[PDB]
């Protein structure tokens, strides 16, 4: 009740991290990557 029981919840957190490890990475890359391109029409048109 005291030792093993809380450890079971503890295992879940360490067992659940391997999925959140990549979601933030992928989102943080595309979101930051898209921000590199210009937004203004004048600047954007000049690129063309």
């Amino acid at each position: 009740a005291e030792e093993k029981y809380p450890e079971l919840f503890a295992t879940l957190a360490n067992d659940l991290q391997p999925l959140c490890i990549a979601l933030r990475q992928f989102y943080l890359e595309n979101y930051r990557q898209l921000d590199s391109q210009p937004r203004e029409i004048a600047a954007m048109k000049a690129q063309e």
Partner: protein
């Protein structure tokens, strides 16, 4: 040149993919909060190699 690119690129994915599973790189994000440039340096270094 064509084959060398095919070799280096495959190696890094084999490394980064297996690097996250191990507890070494796993414990970093429970305390530090973010990569701290590990991925940035890894990608940056790959270009130099």
């Amino acid at each position: 040149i064509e084959a060398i690119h095919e070799l280096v690129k495959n190696f890094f994915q084999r490394l980064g993919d297996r690097l996250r599973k191990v507890d070494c790189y796993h414990q970093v994000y429970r305390l530090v909060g973010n990569d701290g440039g590990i991925e940035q340096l890894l990608r940056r270094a790959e270009e130099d190699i």
